From a paper:
For instance, the U5 snRNP 200 kDa helicase (SNRNP200; Brr2p in yeast) unwinds the initially extensively base-paired U4 and U6 snRNAs during spliceosome activation and releases U4 snRNA and all U4/U6-associated proteins, necessitating re-assembly of the U4/U6 di-snRNP and the U4/U6-U5 tri-snRNP after splicing. SNRNP200 comprises an auto-regulatory N-terminal region (residues 1–394), followed by a helicase region (residues 395–2129; SNRNP200HR) composed of tandem helicase cassettes (N-/C-terminal cassette, NC/CC). Both helicase cassettes comprise dual RecA-like NTPase domains, a winged helix (WH) domain, a helical bundle (HB) domain, a helix-loop-helix (HLH) domain and an immunoglobulin-like (IG) domain. Only the N-terminal cassette (residues 395–1324; SNRNP200NC) is an active ATPase/RNA helicase, while the C-terminal cassette (residues 1282–2136; SNRNP200CC) is catalytically inactive and serves as an intra-molecular regulator of the NC helicase activity.
We have previously characterized the interaction of SNRNP200 with two splicing factors that are also largely intrinsically disordered, FBP21 and C9ORF78 (34,35). FBP21 enters the spliceosome during formation of the pre-catalytic B complex together with seven additional B-specific proteins and leaves the spliceosome again during the following activation step, likely facilitating ordered transitions toward a catalytically competent spliceosome. Like TSSC4, both proteins also contact the SNRNP200 CC. Notably, the binding site of TSSC4 binding region 4 (residues 303–318) overlaps with a binding site of FBP21 and C9ORF78 regions at the Sec63 unit of the SNRNP200 CC. Moreover, all three proteins employ an F-R (F315-R316 in TSSC4; F8-R9 in C9ORF78) or L-R (L369-R370 in FBP21) motif to engage in similar contacts with the F1983, E1944 and E2119 residues of SNRNP200HR. This observation supports the idea that the SNRNP200 CC serves as a latching point for diverse intrinsically disordered proteins (IDPs) that either function during snRNP assembly (TSSC4) or during different stages of the splicing cycle (FBP21, C9ORF78). Mutually exclusive binding of the three proteins to SNRNP200 may serve to prevent premature interactions during U5 snRNP assembly (TSSC4) or support ordered recruitment of regulatory proteins during splicing (FBP21 and C9ORF78). Instead of full-length FBP21, we employed a C-terminal fragment (FBP21200–376) that encompasses the SNRNP200 CC-binding region. FBP21200–376 was fully displaced by GST-TSSC4 while, due to an excess of SNRNP200HR–C9ORF78 over GST–TSSC4 in case of the SNRNP200HR–C9ORF78/GST–TSSC4 mixture, a small amount of binary SNRNP200HR–C9ORF78 complex eluted from the SEC column in addition to SNRNP200HR–GST–TSSC4 and isolated C9ORF78. These observations indicate that TSSC4 exhibits a higher affinity to SNRNP200HR compared to FBP21200–376 or C9ORF78 and prevents binding of the latter two proteins.
Residue numbers in the entry:
A (entry chain F): 336 to 342, 357 to 375
B (entry chain B): 406 to 2125
Amino acid sequence: FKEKTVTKKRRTENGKSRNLRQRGDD
Amino acid sequence: RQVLDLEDLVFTQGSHFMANKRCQLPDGSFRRQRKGYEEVHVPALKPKPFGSEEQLLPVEKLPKYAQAGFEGFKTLNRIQSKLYRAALETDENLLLCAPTGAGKTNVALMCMLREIGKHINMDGTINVDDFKIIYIAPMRSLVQEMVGSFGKRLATYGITVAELTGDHQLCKEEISATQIIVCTPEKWDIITRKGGERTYTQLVRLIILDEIHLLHDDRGPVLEALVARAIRNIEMTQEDVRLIGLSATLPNYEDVATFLRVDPAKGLFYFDNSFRPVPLEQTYVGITEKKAIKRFQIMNEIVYEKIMEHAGKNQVLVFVHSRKETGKTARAIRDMCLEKDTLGLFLREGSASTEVLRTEAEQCKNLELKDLLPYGFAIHHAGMTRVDRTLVEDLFADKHIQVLVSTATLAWGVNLPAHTVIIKGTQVYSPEKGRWTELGALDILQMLGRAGRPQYDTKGEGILITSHGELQYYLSLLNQQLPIESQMVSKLPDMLNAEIVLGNVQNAKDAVNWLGYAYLYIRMLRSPTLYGISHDDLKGDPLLDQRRLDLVHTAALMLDKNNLVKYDKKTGNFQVTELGRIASHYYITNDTVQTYNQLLKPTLSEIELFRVFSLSSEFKNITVREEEKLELQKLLERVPIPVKESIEEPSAKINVLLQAFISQLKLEGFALMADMVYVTQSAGRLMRAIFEIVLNRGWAQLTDKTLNLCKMIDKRMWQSMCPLRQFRKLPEEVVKKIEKKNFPFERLYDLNHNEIGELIRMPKMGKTIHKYVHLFPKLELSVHLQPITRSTLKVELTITPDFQWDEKVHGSSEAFWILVEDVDSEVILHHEYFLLKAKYAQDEHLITFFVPVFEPLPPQYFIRVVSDRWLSCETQLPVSFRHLILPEKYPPPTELLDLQPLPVSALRNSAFESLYQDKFPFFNPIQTQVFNTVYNSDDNVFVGAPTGSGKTICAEFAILRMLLQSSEGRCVYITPMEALAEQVYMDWYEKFQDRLNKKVVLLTGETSTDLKLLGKGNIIISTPEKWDILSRRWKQRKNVQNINLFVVDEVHLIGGENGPVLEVICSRMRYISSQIERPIRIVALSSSLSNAKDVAHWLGCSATSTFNFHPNVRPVPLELHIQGFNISHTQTRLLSMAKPVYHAITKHSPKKPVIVFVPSRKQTRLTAIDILTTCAADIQRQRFLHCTEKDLIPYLEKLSDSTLKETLLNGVGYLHEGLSPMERRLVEQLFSSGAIQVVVASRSLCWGMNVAAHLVIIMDTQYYNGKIHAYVDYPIYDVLQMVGHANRPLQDDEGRCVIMCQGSKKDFFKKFLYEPLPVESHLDHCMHDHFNAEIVTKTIENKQDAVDYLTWTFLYRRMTQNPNYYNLQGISHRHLSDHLSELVEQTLSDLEQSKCISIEDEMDVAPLNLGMIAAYYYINYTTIELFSMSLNAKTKVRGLIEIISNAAEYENIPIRHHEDNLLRQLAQKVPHKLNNPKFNDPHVKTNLLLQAHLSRMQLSAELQSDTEEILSKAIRLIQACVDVLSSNGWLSPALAAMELAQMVTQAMWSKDSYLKQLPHFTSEHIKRCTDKGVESVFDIMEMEDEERNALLQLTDSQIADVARFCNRYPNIELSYEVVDKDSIRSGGPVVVLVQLEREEEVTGPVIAPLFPQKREEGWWVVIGDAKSNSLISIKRLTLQQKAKVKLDFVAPATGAHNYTLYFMSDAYMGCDQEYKFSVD
């Protein structure tokens, strides 16, 4: 019945394990 | 102004008075006299020859939408062909003057089709709720036929037409339902007078005045008033309403066209008798016979003679005056034709049963029609049977009934034309005239119209029978030689009273102008000599303004004499007295009021009441006919109430007639019937009005008697007999058997159905009666009284329905009157109206009202709830006073010393003087008196002055003394309202930090920031909750202990809501001052308080340093005017109240700023627009704008709203919460600068305003509460603060406040507003949280400590002064100790029950874990108990949202009106559905709003603010849920709660992809992101800029800001190490060290787009075992740059295990790291 409201260069990086939790299809 | 005698001016004898002078007869006419009577025959005039290029319009030739509603017609007739263009193509006022029966109803339908065609919408549908049409008809029997015909014609359009008859409340719903309303002039006029037309008056676009020539019939007042009101309303509101008048051909029609605002060139159509579609010959007969018997004898053979002319060839329709006369005339004519020569042979013309066979088949009836039908005669009259009337109609339509005699209702009630129609008698009995009068002109015309069938008749003559003395009139009427005049003169005063009550004419000038629209004015202009105006007088004033002034003065003095309306000769203004309002409401002439006033008295007996009713001026004419005098005597000895002072006078006749009607006695006389009806219909109104009259004067006995008589009149019952007759279904004999037993009705309640049946000896229905017993309305009452002051009480009444609700018997709602009566029970202290709605039946209702008492206390007051329309349906409760202790009398307020004004130079330091020397050189007397004590002494002080007296200057005096005492000192300023805190912060930032370079800070939510500000700042502005959070742990925090000054503002608010927190913090500060051995000065500022000594003693203020000033010591004198309106319905109240707002603005403050406070945000727009349209109504346009529009344009460009822009251009602006803060700042600046004059603000915005005006108006003093589903009054402190705004000291010499309220609250406002009010602590109810908080911080260690701690509170001071307010019985120290012990025992028992605290040995108390969680996050204890109970080891985000939405902090969220439809619509949209929820439950609304916001959808802006509030409160609840789950040791629910926090901040579902966080992103952007392989924000941080660019459509800003967000997104790198993982054993401690690093240096707070409030990054480190779903350890932290965190637990058995370490955020999704490690 209603609408849905919506809402430089950085390249800094360093070696890392970069492990994130899986979504798990919650 | 001169007094003109109304009686001489008005022409008498009503419609019969003929303006015609000679009545020239047409060429086609002749007159011939035989024996004693003369017959005048005027043959049918040949229809006017068709002109060139003139032809009837084919039906297919008109607009397509109008084709429907004309089926069955080949073409429109000549008249309709003439008028179709004006009716359907132009929106012009019309006046159609055509002979009757010419099809004027079809022209009205063409106009209605025009109005419908303005709403053809799309796909062949009609906007049903966009318009309404009013059709005015003169006869009700015509109204019903109009309803039926229009329903049949307009059925295909889906449009409903209905008659307006019924009760006003029933009329309200009827009007709302339908689109076309057909009603009588009196009905529409009375509905308009009652105000029932107010709601839909903007939807009425077309009004049709059918038979508009009726004006001459002395209904001219009723019709003229309506038309003039409508035209004047058109001019006032500038709205357009189209008027269509339908009239017969008569002289001076152009005057009616002028009166109708009809253009003669375009909208005027006049057709003479020639235009008659079907030619008809008019045949008059005039009898010169004098004696009645012979005249009536002649009439029979007259009818027979003319009947024989069309005996065998034409259907004759005869009309008779009365219902009974129909059959008598039919039998007489049948006998006359049969007895002589048997003329009935061909008069029927069976012709060997060629046609008679059908009637011989239809003889199978059971009336007198059975006799007449075989001979061809028939009778049609009202009554008979419904089937009989349609049978005779259909049989006559097929040319079977040769002769049909009928009554006047046939002409209106069904379209049944005939060849020859004859009217017999033309003499009808008028009960209003109390005599035999000739029938109305209009009825004659309508009857003649039916004569001649449209297509089967070439020409059909019509015959009229009348006395020869009245022939000319009839001739004059049908030869269109009789002009129409006005009878406004006689009825003028009543019309003036109706106008004054409506409010259209405030002053005599307005009434003089109002007469300008009346048809009487036009008629006086055209024919001055007829209306008693000389030609030289006409030459004197061309517009006769002086003449109108004369009559206005006469009517006004007459009305003032009866005290209906107050009238002043000096100015001419009219003041509506309440009695006049009642008189206007119930169509009561001024004479009847003048009689009631000199007859009504408090001691009237019932017999005397009936006699008083009999003397009403409505019956001033009725007499006692001698022929029925004998009959009245037998009626007299049968009626119950004796009729004294009666010798068979008109009063005696009326009294016995009314008693007979009440007792339902049968009467054998025709004449009495008419009288019998006329009184009864009248009585229903009068008995109500008298009740109203006596209800306002507060007479306890007469009110009950009058209301009982009203109910008896309505129900046709006597109070003596059993009330069960009120149910029509119950068999009469059974009720009579019940009445035979002297068995009281209430004893029925306790008896079962079998017992009832055996008592009545009829067990078979014994159950059914039982049902009816439980259908009778009955309430249970409970009363809780609290003595507010010495002279007034506050009584809360709880009403509990005790009966099954049945929509058949009861209806949509029930009405009750609540009456409070003194001990004598002869006077009403207070009365109120209560409405029990069907939806909310069987729900306890709470009604709070204030009643006054006196020093010698009477033993009892009686509270009676009496049903409004049910007899013997009252409930009485005796409120006792044998154990009432009134509050101690307050001491006199501090007198105002007349000290010499203090110069600013009094302050020693020049820098301090520089603060104020610019604003003013001298202080007002209040602060001159206070200055010595405050500035030159160091002790606690209390200042009580009316708001607007500059007590903030006294607070600044204290602060300056503190600064002088010590270079660096700390002052804490606590103000109960957040907006006030902001305003004070801005003012003192301008005043202290800028000039004196001293730190000034305002506290916020976050405790760490508050600690920093308290450490650095010197002045600390705060609200009670924010300071309470800090001061709870005052023992640990050193800064709180040592503050030099503590200032409290609005100390009097402790009585109201959010008072306990303020009281608790004040008491805690007093305790800290006592404990720290370094006194903390306390300065309290408040409004004048009656019990100022108690507050001063509570805060330690000495007797000499307590200042309590009377409200009359205001520096700017205040003039308060309370205006009470006796209307219960809120919407109706406000709609009637809109105009008095403008009237008060004009009267009080014409050229000075005005502020109007309304109840609701929605109401603000409506009030602003209504005031603007009323201002544009008046002669002065846009007077509220003083600047130029060129200066406005720069300001207007900043605005966004359109309605506000439109209003500002005329000089009215409105403020509410929805407006952006920039917009409010701009409008406040505009108002302060003087550009605009009137601002309308929402009441909830009253605290947050920095603008003062010369006049302040309070709109309704009530607001809707959805949780309680009832209307509640504003808090007295709130209303007082609103009144405080009227304070402009520099220029205005005085301030004025108009408080407009319901009449019930009017006295209470007078009691409290004028003098100091009392304040009472409510800490007793809201005490669990504070005790829990104290126990947590070890302040309270046992019950004795809590008892001692209670002594520091203001409650302990009040309970020994006003005991009964706190349920105390005694006043001794023993009673107080017992009450304190019981109260603390109850509170500690509750806390133990919720497991917040542990009670050991029934003496000691210790804090448990749940208590620590509840106190740490400042959460109500009920919420933490609910979290502990509901949460389990398997709840997901759905259950978590459901639980959080059930928190107690959301109980106070508002539920506005009509939100339920929007909420029910929204409930379908949300992803997770509820389980049959109640949409008035605030928790359900919070759950729905949380789901809506999480899904990123957008709702209507009004409901949007609640979402911001909910989200503001949510995050602490989520953190508490996390802490509780961690305490219980559950892993998955804790992770679900953390994800819930993340997703509520980012406003997205968990299932939704992470990408939605990024700004300016959509599902299509995300889909183009997906297939590429981009799923996480980190890869965007790792994207070579060109690929992010080319892949994602952008601007400068899109790439710039999205990439910047990527910077804000926290990437942080951590390493964990298990210390001594080798040398570890089962049961030993296990310690893990975690190092967290952010190479990037954090800049600013979390970038939360949708989340309103600013938030910071919070992180959780969790060690758990996924397989067992057990949370081993958890720790919360905030990462600034880097951190070193220690986690500890105990090792399990059997060595090796493998836990998982979770690192979870609370503001950004996707950065939750997992690391798996083993042990042993």
